[PDB]
Design a protein around this nucleic acid. Sequence first.
RNA 1: AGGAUGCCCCCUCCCGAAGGAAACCCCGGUGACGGGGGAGUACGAGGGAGGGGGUCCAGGGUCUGCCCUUACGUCUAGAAA
RNA 2: GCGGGGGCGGUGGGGUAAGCCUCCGCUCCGAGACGGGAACAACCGAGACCGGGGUUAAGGCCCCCAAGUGCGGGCUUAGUGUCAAUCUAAAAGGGCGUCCCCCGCCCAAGACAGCCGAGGCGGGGGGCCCCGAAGAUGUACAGGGACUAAGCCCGCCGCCGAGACCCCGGCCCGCGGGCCGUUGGCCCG
Lengths: 90, 195, 169, 183, 183, 76
Amino acid sequence: VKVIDVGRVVVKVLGREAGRKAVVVDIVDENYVVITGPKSLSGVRRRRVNINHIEPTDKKIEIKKGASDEEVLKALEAAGLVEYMKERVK
Amino acid sequence: MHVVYAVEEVPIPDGVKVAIEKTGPFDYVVKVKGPLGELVKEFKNTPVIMSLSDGKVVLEVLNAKKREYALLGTYKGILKNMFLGVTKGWRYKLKVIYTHFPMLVKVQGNQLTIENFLGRKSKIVLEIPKGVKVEVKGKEDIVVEGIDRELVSQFAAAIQAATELRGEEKPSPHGREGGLGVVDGIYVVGYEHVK
Amino acid sequence: ARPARCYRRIKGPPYTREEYIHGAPMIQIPKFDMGTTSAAARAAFTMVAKLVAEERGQIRMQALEAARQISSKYLTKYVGDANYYLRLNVVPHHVLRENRMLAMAGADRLQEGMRLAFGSPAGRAARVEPGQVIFYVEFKPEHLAHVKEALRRAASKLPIPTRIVVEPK
Amino acid sequence: PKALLYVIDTAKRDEYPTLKNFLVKGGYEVDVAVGSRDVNVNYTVDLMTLPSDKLPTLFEEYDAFALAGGFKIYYHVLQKKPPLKIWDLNIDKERLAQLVVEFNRRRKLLIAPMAVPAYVAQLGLLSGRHATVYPVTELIKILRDNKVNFVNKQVVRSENIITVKDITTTSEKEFLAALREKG
Amino acid sequence: MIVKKVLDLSQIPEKGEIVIDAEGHIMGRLASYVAKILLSKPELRVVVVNAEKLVVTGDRKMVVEWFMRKISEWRTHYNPEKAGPKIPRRPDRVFKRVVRGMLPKKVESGRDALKRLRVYMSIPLDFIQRRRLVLYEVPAAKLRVRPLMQFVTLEEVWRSIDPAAWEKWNKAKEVWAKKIKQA
Amino acid sequence: PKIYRVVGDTSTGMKFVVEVVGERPYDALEKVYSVLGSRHKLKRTQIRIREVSVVEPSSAKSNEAKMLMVLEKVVR
RNA sequence: AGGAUGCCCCCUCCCGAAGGAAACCCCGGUGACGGGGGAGUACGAGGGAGGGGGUCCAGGGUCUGCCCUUACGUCUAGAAA
RNA sequence: GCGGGGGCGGUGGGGUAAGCCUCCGCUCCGAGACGGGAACAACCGAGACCGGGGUUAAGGCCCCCAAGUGCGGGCUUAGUGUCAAUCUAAAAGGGCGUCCCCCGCCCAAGACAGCCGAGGCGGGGGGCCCCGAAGAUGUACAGGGACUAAGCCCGCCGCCGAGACCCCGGCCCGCGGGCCGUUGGCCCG
Ligand SMILES: [Mg+2]
Ligand SMILES: [Mg+2]
Ligand SMILES: [Mg+2]
Ligand SMILES: [Mg+2]
Ligand SMILES: [Mg+2]
Ligand SMILES: [Mg+2]
Ligand SMILES: [Mg+2]
Ligand SMILES: [Mg+2]
Ligand SMILES: [Mg+2]
Ligand SMILES: [Mg+2]
Ligand SMILES: [Mg+2]
Ligand SMILES: [Mg+2]
Ligand SMILES: [Mg+2]
């Protein structure tokens, strides 16, 4: 089963930003979540996304619900995932 | 309606050890051990998430409708029977009722046999399942014991069903002009714990 | 009588001018207003229930009469004639025709089939529109359950679907 | 510099993404505003729920104001019934007029595409000036009735007001030449 | 050894043989992919193994009754061997018949395509003994397992409509289990 | 994410006040159109939205909306 | 009795109607995808020029594959009937 | 030629009804190719000189079969159903089966169910489905495979697809003009 949780690093599999990495920062409902690249980092804008269009990775950072990009970027440093985000899958 | 999230807790009693094993994507095998024995139950193809928390069994459903939500109360009820089954046991009591022909109930090995029901020459023979003990108390009372309440109640129901005639053999329940008719049989009268 | 499905639909113009119709049948409904009809006593009643047509169609005179009997009998038994006012609101003006071979009904009726097909009178019906009130009841709010039951029984006798509307006067 | 891009309508499919792209290539940083519940694009400024005392903060913070006015503005200027109900102007008209006039007063940059120039013309902000508009008969007439000189160029700049005929038929070079012009 | 791979629907080879492991696949959905592969690659051979693990969605009683009606009520009154239907029951023959229904009828290309398909129950020993056996899956044809969903396997269907034949095959699996396990 | 209180009525005489969780009013309205369209066979033209307003989670009436607000994870 | 100054392949070159992409960069959308650039480009019915290689080409008999396809004459509103 | 016919509309008028009889009007078949509709004169699209290129229409895009196992939300568990008509179906009535909307009343934690502690009781309506639902050569018929979506509802994106539309080449025609001693021939617009 697919599990999407706040802080999880995910990969987008649909849309122009396909193959890019992103961080889940909020939950809208059972079907949509909010992800942020951060944009300056991986090229993913801060938008809602349907769960069907993302796949979870094995990496997770710790943040609060609705975390800002700077808070996300800082948490990406305490985990050392900065170069993990710039890599494009497939 | 629709349920975003719902949780139920079943407290494990003292002396009872509970193991939960995932035998499939949505299948569970729950093993319960107590002073009186070990029960094994399968919950297959189920939406209820089953987990242990420091001496409780936690049951959860996510994104559930009424159909899935209704299974939380069911699994809690089943688990509670398992806990009482290994600590107190289950005893189902049956009463033998006859009008003219006295029934002769005896237990021979793992066979329960009822003779002379309504004066029939045929003998009702039932196979006693493993884990069930049957004792005949006097001529009127039968007792079925065990740790699996489902198994024990089902066998007690089978004894009662064996004495209920169907089709063209069914006797009239009421007598002439409305009195009691030929009402002979073995009736489950209640249940209680062994301890 | 034919099955009522044969005359349910509105398939032509109304046929009501009895001065041009030979042998138009007499109306076989004895009363149309039942219960307490005097306007002074109706002031005690404060509720109104209506059996309202849901489709357009033709209701035969005998179905209106059957519906009137079952509902009025029920109200007389359970509510009491002093405690309600029931009115059959539509009148069977339309005359129904049938093309059957018959004796003592004119020489043209002796020709078989569709030759000279214009039928002889066979009965009466009311032509109703959607939303039209078929039955109208005035009652006291304590008898709401009984009035709804009476109108449910009336509806089971009628050839078109209906619905019950309850409103204050 | 920062530009505020009011997305009134999206019925013109490519109007907003194209306008934003040109402004970004023109060096601006674009903040998106929305004043109606029918617009589907992401935005950071909610002109529907933004209090009026916060308006003076908005004029100071932005150097340009662009209006993605699709067919909603077109049928409001003409006072005509649109063929679709969704093309009705379902925004606060008084606030919109207040925004345009105030940005114009502080001599900030105004980008008016398609039928927006006729809306600015009806506000009296282009009297005696040169402007272009979506060149249909009725819109050209409205410009002339408001004492505006119609010019048949794709992009026309009148000293702080840039008007374009149709952002979807405007090349990047033409738009950037007018952005870099002097006014 | 056995190597599991995901079949690339655009990188099918033009020659040779691919082996598809049918376990967990929906029968009609896998048949659709198999039928298209055989027609679009007229030189490729397709082997399907584990055909008894194919899944048919729906209630078990509903699926079994459907098969019972097919094998019982569908017949001819003319010469049965010369003119009548001959309904398969075994999972490998059942699945091959399903693919036949998705191929062109009464033409050589439809016939040639079916002759290029082989279906097996479980994995044949000669395939197992290979130094490197590549088994493909078709994820779009795989069953997405959800709670309270009803489905059956083609093996359970076969057991319902031919118990003695299923028992022999089941016993054969037991007899050769040790040698199959060795390989 | 916010709870939006949507007040509306239909050409078929039905009235409704519902609470829908969404990112923006546009997302909440899309859910209203698709769900009402599904559950009552109502075309979008037959639905008239009269009022959309944010309601704070403390004062909402729907436990569905409240529970979505505090969600930390989802499962598919 | 027809062409063999043919036909076929390859390569190169020129022109080219209607129409007309892609990689990739940028803007939007949950998304299927849209838009600016790349680009009226690569290409495109056909029309011209040359070079290398081969041997028959057209036409005919019959068979196979793929696609299409309901004997004829007649009265009739209506014919495979 | 003075036999007409199909679709749609006048509750046309008649008739229990009819692929029924008898009027009025637009269109189509007869006398009209071709794409779609499973097949099918007249339903949808559309009007065909010949060859070639391109783009669309109706309709379709899991396989048969060219193009999506296309996107978001919701519903159905009955293989219900499987994108208008010809064409193979269904009613009155019953069902909180399930999803949903509204109203009235009780509970201010002393409500409903048998002290406990949080929601509860009734009415009206809507969606899908279930029962009502029974036939004769051969399978859940209405194209087949099969599908739990490849079904249904609210919306959306792209693509495929005619002889139509666009383009090139060839041909023919009507009309007009011109040339040639012409019961005719040739050229141009
Ligand atoms: Mg009529
Ligand atoms: Mg044979
Ligand atoms: Mg020669
Ligand atoms: Mg004839
Ligand atoms: Mg004839
Ligand atoms: Mg003929
Ligand atoms: Mg005649
Ligand atoms: Mg006609
Ligand atoms: Mg003729
Ligand atoms: Mg056809
Ligand atoms: Mg294809
Ligand atoms: Mg009927
Ligand atoms: Mg069916």
